[PDB]
DNA sequence: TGTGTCAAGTGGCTGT
DNA sequence: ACAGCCACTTGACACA
């Protein structure tokens, strides 16, 4: 047999409260790169699961750089 | 009506 | 073998 499995999974935009954001911003705006017992603790404060921290921290370090592609321009033939 | 945005989803080589 | 962000992209979400 081969296919994977019966899965049909569902990510609706799984948004953290501006507060939770703020602490995520906070922890980004301070720090690029977190060991779990730091970051879980943010996950603890704002009461998310630590990947939901991490993943908001992943989404920022690429997001920055792109912004900066703007600044000058997206100069590509 | 359609898309960007956001968060994942997903996928890719790098080193010990 | 080993661990997995980084960058693209879809998969739900705001908006003219």
Q: Which residues of A9-31 are buried (b: 16+ CB within 10 A; e: fewer)?
A: eeeeeeebeeebeebbeebbeee
Question: Does residue A37 contact residue A47 with C-beta atoms inside 8 Å?
Answer: no
Show Cβ contacts of residue A23 under 8 Å, excluding neighbours closer than 6 positions: A42, A45, A46
**A72 CA, C11 C1': Å apart:** 31
Residues 11-70 of chain A in contact with strand B via CB under 7 angstroms? 11, 13-16, 21, 51-52, 55-56, 59, 63
Experimental technique used to determine this entry: NMR
The reply to whether A8 has its C-beta less than 7 Å from any atom of strand C is no
Q: Report which residue is nearest nucleotide C11 when distances run from CA to C1'.
A: A11
Distance CA A57, CA A48 (A): 13
Distance CA A61, CA A23 (A): 16
How many Cβ atoms are within 10 Å of A46's Cβ, its own excluded?
A: 20
Domains present along chain A, CATH in parentheses: 1-77 (1.10.10.60)
- In the Cβ-directed half-sphere of A1, how many Cα atoms lie within 13 Å? 4
Question: Does residue A43 contact residue A50 with C-beta atoms inside 8 Å?
Answer: yes
């Amino acid at each position: 047999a081969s296919d994977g499995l019966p899965n049909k999974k569902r990510k609706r935009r799984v948004l953290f409260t501006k507060a939770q954001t703020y602490e995520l911003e906070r922890r980004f705006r301070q720090q690029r790169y977190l060991s779990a017992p730091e970051r879980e603790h943010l996950a603890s404060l704002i009461r998310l699961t630590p990947t939901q921290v991490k993943i908001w921290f992943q989404n920022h370090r690429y997001k920055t750089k792109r912004a900066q592609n703007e600044k000058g321009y997206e100069g590509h033939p």
